[PDB]
Ligand binder design. Structure first.
Ligand SMILES: CC(=O)N[C@@H]1[C@@H](O[C@@H]2O[C@H](CO)[C@H](O)[C@H](O[C@]3(C(=O)O)C[C@H](O)[C@@H](NC(C)=O)[C@H]([C@H](O)[C@H](O)CO)O3)[C@H]2O)[C@H](O)[C@@H](CO)O[C@H]1O
Ligand SMILES: CC(=O)N[C@@H]1[C@@H](O[C@@H]2O[C@H](CO)[C@H](O)[C@H](O[C@]3(C(=O)O)C[C@H](O)[C@@H](NC(C)=O)[C@H]([C@H](O)[C@H](O)CO)O3)[C@H]2O)[C@H](O)[C@@H](CO)O[C@H]1O
Ligand SMILES: CC(=O)N[C@@H]1[C@@H](O[C@@H]2O[C@H](CO)[C@H](O)[C@H](O[C@]3(C(=O)O)C[C@H](O)[C@@H](NC(C)=O)[C@H]([C@H](O)[C@H](O)CO)O3)[C@H]2O)[C@H](O)[C@@H](CO)O[C@H]1O
Ligand SMILES: *[C@@H]1O[C@H](CO)[C@@H](O)[C@H](O)[C@H]1NC(C)=O
Ligand SMILES: *[C@@H]1O[C@H](CO)[C@@H](O)[C@H](O)[C@H]1NC(C)=O
Ligand SMILES: *[C@@H]1O[C@H](CO)[C@@H](O)[C@H](O)[C@H]1NC(C)=O
Ligand SMILES: *[C@@H]1O[C@H](CO)[C@@H](O)[C@H](O)[C@H]1NC(C)=O
Ligand SMILES: *[C@@H]1O[C@H](CO)[C@@H](O)[C@H](O)[C@H]1NC(C)=O
Ligand SMILES: *[C@@H]1O[C@H](CO)[C@@H](O)[C@H](O)[C@H]1NC(C)=O
Ligand SMILES: *[C@@H]1O[C@H](CO)[C@@H](O)[C@H](O)[C@H]1NC(C)=O
Ligand SMILES: *[C@@H]1O[C@H](CO)[C@@H](O)[C@H](O)[C@H]1NC(C)=O
Ligand SMILES: *[C@H]1O[C@H](CO)[C@@H](O)[C@H](O)[C@H]1NC(C)=O
Lengths: 164, 322, 322, 163, 324, 163
């Protein structure tokens, strides 16, 4: 994708994370486990829901065909009528199909961006205290227990403390 | 062996696919279909109101009262009207209905008529009023339209007819009458005595004077004669005046327009379906919360928006990995 | 203590909001409204040219010269025409104007007529030309249309009329005439003597033969008779030929089409506002540099593009977070 | 936003920078000051101006309704006329509204991208000579005077000297 | 001299330019033009089938058989019809064609007529059938329409005509006839004897009775008289019945509709181009694989989609900035 | 551009790389040269080709004007016909012009993103083993022969081996 995260430097997604769209996998002394990021997942649900609602609402005042009848000596206006109604149906079919294609592309890049932003959020916190493997994971230099792992997810990691 | 944290994204067992501009069939974790592609194949009541199913009759056969259309002598309020592509029972006596399409257009904004008498058969003391045709059979015998009357000469005379009706109702009235175009001069005198005839019709806005047209025509429904029908809307407090010395197909009954609203004339071969719907098309009803459908362009009710698409699917989730 | 440089972006006090696909009401530092939502509620001159405000008259009433419309006997050049939905002064003598809408369509491309006499009242030596009706009052006394003439019998005779007018002008000429449809056979002979009448009209392209329609009709403006009016465009160097032995409502005046251009017939209940504008709608004028407006779909002049939108705001600056 | 800078790693905007859309805040031994980056700001101004004009110009040839009259027996063509005119008005209303929504989204993301690019421009200049704090700020290891701050803003800061 | 690897992208000498929302004239390494802007300026055969080029004749002049239009008495199958804006050879005898535009509409779905004689000119025993006019010259002599017949009195008499034709063919039949509107009462009797006349015409659906309109009219092609023409489609097995005691312009030949399909009446001043095309416009043919064109809105055949654009170009490659 | 790579931190394009859209330049003891990254180039070629096809195919059911004829007293319906045909032509002209503008913008950004992603692919492979110069080049700390260079391009660079 545009942002290089999904199926990029993060090679695949996790079956193990059912809790949200984006999150963390930790592994320490206390154990290992998946944890979805609440903030980014919620933001994305909102963005995607609003998008869906917007698409429907813009198509809300669309053309509606009406039955009109013409006699044998009114073929010209009958044909004019047909091409008019077909004309608007073709315009709105185009509008609906193209909008879905374009917004689908944007939706996939939106998730890709969210994953990259989440990765950067952790990177800018950990800095020198972690080794960057290049696959979405950070190898700690200092030991980080369950409470230490939580401060990273919260965005309250205290760098000066773990300097060592 | 030292501790680590990883960043990742959701994957699942979804096989749902979407399209984008640059690639097709992208598997995503979540997708939302927005297109209704199914219907029930039936003609239903529209929100509790039954349609008028004309069966084998046309609008013309119904209103004029083709004897084959007696089922529809006094129909109740309707939600929409269904007519076959080629109804068998139309103008039994061959001819045409003047401004027929403009009349049908008016019907698309009416939900109920109440049929009333405007000229009683008792009015005709000096003319014969029993005229029939084998072109309008009923129970194997010659008959005629129910709502209009074929007047012919009596005692070898056809005195000038003067008839008026004043619309004392609070509703607009649809009035129908016709003219008979005979086969030849001899037929003209045989039926009407007078060789040169007219029908004049006046309201506050209508000013009509029709003259019959003799021509040699092909038999249609066994008859070479023709009848041409005309209509007007008579406003409350206005009156209609007819005058004729022959060839007059006189009104007996007319239609009060009592309920107006959304309606339509649907062309369909389908029968009544003993069901209820919020959205009806000519080929079946729709029960959906999808914003779009591809069933049929012509719909009535609370409906999704019609598009010609075979598929419309929004990606909601993300690219799903194998 | 250590020196530092930071990267940042503008924030300000702006409360301007925009919408995107994924979120609504986003506060931004700068925005640009592109939608004109105001009008002055007046009917104005269009670029220094005053409209023709018909007040209580219709186009038909103006052109035929209904006596109640004398304000409009010789109007100056106009930018657009304003007519009320149901103008009280129309056809004073009841009837209809043939192809009236097609005529009004022609008007939408005309900015000025010059009315000229084409057949003087004095040319009628053997017919009466003083015919009036209480359906057409002037100062509450029986009168008639100013631009056409009601010819009736003189000395119990109506000899055949033959008149020609050759358009020797350099402009197209709008010519008007009519036929009177009487109440009955006795009225017919009383006014025109001859029981069976016609009006033939010919030009290079027109070939008309009109015949009166006697019918029994409701009183409209106190009269049961009717007049049906006709028109043609007579080209430079072509001639119009009239022949009649009764029921002829003859031309007196006709209209030179002296200025063609952009115009329209605006339906509006407003009257003149003593203002000037570059853009006029039926509900008021627009004075704007916006590319879009939502005032009214029907505009004339140099106007913004109409949309049905209630809001159209473009983000120019960035997201403004407190 | 898509690029993670605006209301991202840079938490908020600066009231103190009335001068342009993007720029710098410095604080050295001489004191502190705001300074808008002229190059990136102007580039953005040009892009946004071109965008606005393109939107206005593309909508330039759009439907204009014309008043047409019809008699009592011309209801079918009257209705056809009405549906045709309403039809075009609805299409162009949709076009205008949708284009504004789509380009508003792109415009905000454009600003976001510009901020990230500016930050990166500076990051790549300073390299090892400064510490990136993760909030849009760089902490110098060496002393950097007002003229030294200017070489950073100019894009002329030389690495070899202070390492 | 430590080893190094660099990441970069393609540049070239391209000067191709594209536009975006935010910038115009962006030079790119590669671009694809998607707009056809050229045509051959000719009227060609369409998919191997030659058009009907009416030259100086109108549809009316062709169908009725204006003597100036003899080239078109029995035309072969066509792909489309070409007519000039104002064709010189229309109704030689002045008047009009009733429902002319509806008739032309029907033509847009017809590819081939087969003209047949339905009422022989010889078959008129009690009437003169040699009526001519100086309004319809042919080789400098007064003549008449080829497909219809001007009947007049014989021996100071016009007995009532009763003639029927039954369409025994398997195809629909286009039948043409007319009425003559004379100048005055004396002319009416001079030509037709009977002062008061009519034409009645009947089929299974047609119910016509026409009465001549005497009126004083301007000279057109030297005549103040007028002829008004009518048409109908006679279905297989149906018959047409004519009755008249004067003013009748009788059918002679009618048209079997033998081939139906896609066609059009194109308005153009151009002549035949001795060429073949898949896509024809009124100003020239298109030979292109482009998806769009801006030649002319009115096309027939397998054509690109019309747009009013002067330029449509897609970027395919990248922003072209070679180093220096 | 949006992703900061093309005409960004990588200053200009290479005329010497005639091989593909994106790729590498290496210089070691064995020599120097260009090599296109086959994977990113092919992915981009597919994406762009699909886009060109998508644009063509969506426009497929465009309006098709038909010649219609009206007499002197059918001027209202003649005008209705003309405004209707003109109306659809204007709508489809707009659709075509706008789609091309919007997609041209996306195409240029797509290339920019691909270049940035290719740069990051190498950066995350090399890590500490090479110096990031800031101009799109990496200066190795260890010696990297032609087979070593090929592994970086392959995406199989062995970090622990040289650390
Ligand atoms: C009386 C009889 O049986 N006559 C035989 C002829 O048949 C009659 O032919 C005439 C035409 O000349 C009509 O078609 C007759 O049909 C009706 C009909 O429509 O059914 C009979 C109706 O009773 C009559 N109704 C009225 C009110 O007059 C009706 C009308 O006259 C016409 O429709 C007006 O156009 O006609 C038909 O019965 C037959 O032609 C002949 C053999 O050639 O033998 C006659 O004995
Ligand atoms: C002669 C008289 O006074 N009769 C009284 C009746 O009134 C007359 O009724 C006739 C209809 O029969 C007309 O409506 C008359 O009105 C006019 C009109 O239009 O105003 C009078 C005009 O002078 C006359 N103009 C011309 C040129 O002839 C006009 C026309 O004849 C008609 O419009 C043609 O249709 O008619 C009206 O005065 C009255 O009905 C009766 C009481 O019920 O008493 C009669 O003595
Ligand atoms: C016989 C002759 O030459 N008379 C001179 C007058 O000219 C005649 O004027 C009449 C109208 O009054 C017609 O236009 C005559 O033209 C024709 C025509 O169309 O060419 C002559 C045709 O032979 C005749 N054809 C038929 C079948 O009748 C045709 C028709 O009658 C009319 O078209 C029907 O409307 O008319 C024309 O010759 C001339 O007007 C006069 C001097 O003013 O001198 C006469 O000697
Ligand atoms: C997919 O997984 C869900 C649980 O996440 C389960 O309910 C569903 O049955 C599965 N569907 C399959 C395997 O087709
Ligand atoms: C119809 O009757 C009403 C009530 O008697 C009357 O006022 C009205 O004038 C009549 N209408 C006509 C046209 O005679
Ligand atoms: C917002 O700030 C601007 C100065 O940048 C000033 O002109 C404007 O009046 C202010 N508006 C307020 C405080 O409402
Ligand atoms: C956006 O703001 C307007 C004006 O304050 C308000 O009326 C509307 O409800 C808001 N819409 C939202 C929050 O969706
Ligand atoms: C009208 O008059 C002009 C000039 O006298 C003349 O040339 C022309 O033929 C006349 N038009 C008719 C139809 O008589
Ligand atoms: C660009 O290079 C090609 C050769 O690869 C050549 O055909 C073309 O003329 C060049 N364009 C110039 C010199 O403008
Ligand atoms: C580039 O665009 C400008 C308008 O921005 C235009 O005038 C010019 O013709 C273009 N240059 C060309 C076609 O060489
Ligand atoms: C025409 O001829 C056929 C064959 O003789 C016959 O069946 C048919 O009835 C005729 N049509 C009419 C209308 O008389
Ligand atoms: C996906 O699209 C391809 C063509 O792009 C088509 O052949 C195929 O039917 C679609 N996929 C499936 C699973 O049907």
């Amino acid at each position: 994708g545009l942002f290089g995260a999904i199926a990029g430097f993060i090679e695949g997604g996790w079956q193990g994370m059912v809790d949200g769209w984006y999150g963390y996998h930790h592994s320490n002394e206390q154990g290992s486990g998946y944890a979805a990021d609440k903030e980014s997942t919620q933001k994305a649900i909102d963005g995607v829901t609003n998008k869906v609602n917007s698409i429907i609402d813009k198509m809300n005042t669309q053309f509606e065909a009406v039955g009109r009848e013409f006699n044998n000596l009114e073929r010209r206006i009958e044909n004019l009528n047909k091409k008019m109604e077909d004309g608007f149906l073709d315009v709105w079919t185009y509008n609906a199909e193209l909008l879905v294609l374009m917004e689908n592309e944007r939706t996939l890049d939106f998730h890709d961006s969210n994953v990259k932003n989440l990765y950067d959020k952790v990177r800018l916190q950990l800095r020198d205290n972690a080794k960057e493997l290049g696959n979405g994971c950070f190898e700690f230099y200092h030991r980080c227990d369950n409470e230490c792992m939580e401060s990273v997810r919260n965005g309250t990691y205290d760098y000066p403390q773990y300097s060592e | 062996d030292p501790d680590q944290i990883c960043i990742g994204y959701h994957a699942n067992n979804s096989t749902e696919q979407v399209d984008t501009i640059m690639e097709k069939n992208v598997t995503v974790t979540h997708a939302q279909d927005i297109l209704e592609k199914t219907h029930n194949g039936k003609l239903c009541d529209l929100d509790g109101v039954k349609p008028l199913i004309l069966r084998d009759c046309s609008v013309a056969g119904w209103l004029l009262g083709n004897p084959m259309c007696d089922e529809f002598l006094n129909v109740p309020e309707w939600s929409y009207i269904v007519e076959k592509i080629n109804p068998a029972n139309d103008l039994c006596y061959p001819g045409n209905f003047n401004d027929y399409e403009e009349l049908k257009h008016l019907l698309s904004r009416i939900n109920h008529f109440e049929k009333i008498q405007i000229i009683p058969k008792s009015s005709w003391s000096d003319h014969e009023a029993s005229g029939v045709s084998s072109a309008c059979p009923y129970q194997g015998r010659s008959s005629f339209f129910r709502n209009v009357v074929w007047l012919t000469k009596k005692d070898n005379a056809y005195p000038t007819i003067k008839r008026s009706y004043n619309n004392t109702n609070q509703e607009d009235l649809l009035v129908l009458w016709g003219i008979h175009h005979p086969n030849d001069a001899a037929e003209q005198t045989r039926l009407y005595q007078n060789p040169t005839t007219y029908i004049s019709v006046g309201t506050s806005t209508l000013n009509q004077r029709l003259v019959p047209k003799i021509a040699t025509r092909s038999k249609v429904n066994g008859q070479s004669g023709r009848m041409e029908f005309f209509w007007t809307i008579l406003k409350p407090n206005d009156a209609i005046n007819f005058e004729s010395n022959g060839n007059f197909i006189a009104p007996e009954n007319a239609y009060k327009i009592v309920k107006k609203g959304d309606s339509t004339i649907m062309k369909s071969e389908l029968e009544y379906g003993n069901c209820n719907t919020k959205c009806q098309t000519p080929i079946g009803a729709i029960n959906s919360s999808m914003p779009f459908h591809n069933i049929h362009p012509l719909t009535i009710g609370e409906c999704p928006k019609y598009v010609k698409s075979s598929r419309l699917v929004l990606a909601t989730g993300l690219r799903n990995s194998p």
